[PDB]
């Protein structure tokens, strides 16, 4: 088998699966680990965007009541160190100690904020485990299929601790850990003992190539098999080569800019709103995305299924109202910084250059500040910054509630003083089943989010990959790379 060489935009700081959550971690951790329920993106010949849930580490499951789901595990599944997967490992993955409890907070900083209102899992027998919540939750199934739910081995993880585990991970996945050179490369090798479809690559190397031009030059020279995070502008050059091609898809993620609301200038919504009202999204989509990025009608996406509103009004664009707001805020012309980690996000710097011009036209002076990979500056050094959110559930709960909710980092770390009504709705949507009330509640939260502008949604990006024609691999509609029944060499 051939060794797969990937040229990537970045690498996670840890391979601990929850701590690896980002645009760059899942493409690695999806290989090392498995979940209880997996998504089949290619079901019924779909082009990598199917919503179908299939058994994975759990052979079967059934909801018991409004607060609990019982899982029957696949038997004789082995972790990379030869240890058999049991209900103890699953119970540990979803425990108070490891994930969501007070003791987990130092190990996994966003563990509590990103998890459901869990109670301790109940081990029924060697291959049976019940996962439960303290309050009603109709989200257990989607959460279990998510990137929060990769199964870790109890004994090994406990012996290493979360930090050491992140540097030497052990999972049940099709590929096992070889090496991790901080901010340089991650090397994995085939786990030939895998319970599912056998790995088709002998080795997988994720090599950081921060500059997108250097990444393209690497692919042309034959240094890489697949490269990530390109823009639709790179398409024509790569496809002119008979041995190379581009492979792209709209992903279930949105690019945005956000604010440090602990800063005096952003404590009040006025200037946040003015900056939001001046963003001409259709012009950015034409100029940078060749019409391929999608502009959502609010914090609202098709993957939400029952909580997606196809009838919602477009996010407002109003230059005159933006000008009136800049004057009202008493803004004095002082430059406001906007932090970006180069082009970690496709089109980050070109989008910022366009926005700086749009903002200069409303009387706001914004200046770009770059930071190095894995070198995010202290919070007090930041005003504006770009970010993204992967829409990780088949429900509107993520990411409005885990990121922007009363327990989330936007309010707790970044100082958004959310209206009491918003926080009250977050709590209501957490516990309600789908229906008219829950659907209407998300639309009200969406309206408040637009009035408050704690972040400004830009678009759903069109993820662009480039690969050697002889490397058969299809992108999926999520910020990850799937190789199960989706990797072969010509
Ligand atoms: O990197 C972000 C992460 O910080 C979290 O918001 C989830 O979505 C990802 O895209």
Author numbering: 32 to 521
Paper text:
To our knowledge, the best known system that exemplifies this paradigm is the antibiotic agrocin 84, which penetrates into the cytoplasm of the bacterial pathogen Agrobacterium tumefaciens strain C58 by hijacking the PBP called AccA and its cognate transporter. AccA also plays a key-role in the importation of the characteristic plant tumour-derived compounds such as the opines agrocinopines A and B discovered in 1981 in crown gall tumour tissue. The mature AccA structure is a monomer of 493 residues composed of two lobes, each formed by a central β-sheet flanked by α-helices. We identified the pyranose-2-phosphate-like moiety shared by these two ligands as the key recognition template for AccA.
A better resolution structure of this complex at 1.9 Å resolution in a different space group using the native protein was determined. The two agrocinopine-complexed structures are very similar, displaying an average root mean square deviation (rmsd) of 0.35 Å over 489 Cα atoms. Overall, the ligand bound structures are very similar (average rmsd value of 0.33 Å over 490 Cα atoms) adopting a closed conformation. The major difference concerns the region comprising the residues 403–408, which can move up to 1.7 Å to accommodate the ligand in the binding site. While Agrocinopine A is fully defined in the electron density maps, the leucine-like moiety of agrocin 84 is mobile. It makes extensive protein hydrogen bonds: 8 for L-arabinose and 10 for D-glucose. In contrast, the sucrose moiety of agrocinopine A and the TM84 part of agrocin 84 make only 3 and 2 polar interactions with AccA, respectively. A particularity of AccA which is not shared by these related PBPs is the presence of the flexible loop 402–414 located between the β-strands β15 and β16 which can accommodate agrocinopine A. This loop corresponds to a conserved rigid helix in all similar PBPs and models superposition shows that an equivalent helix in our structure would clash with the last glucose of agrocinopine A.
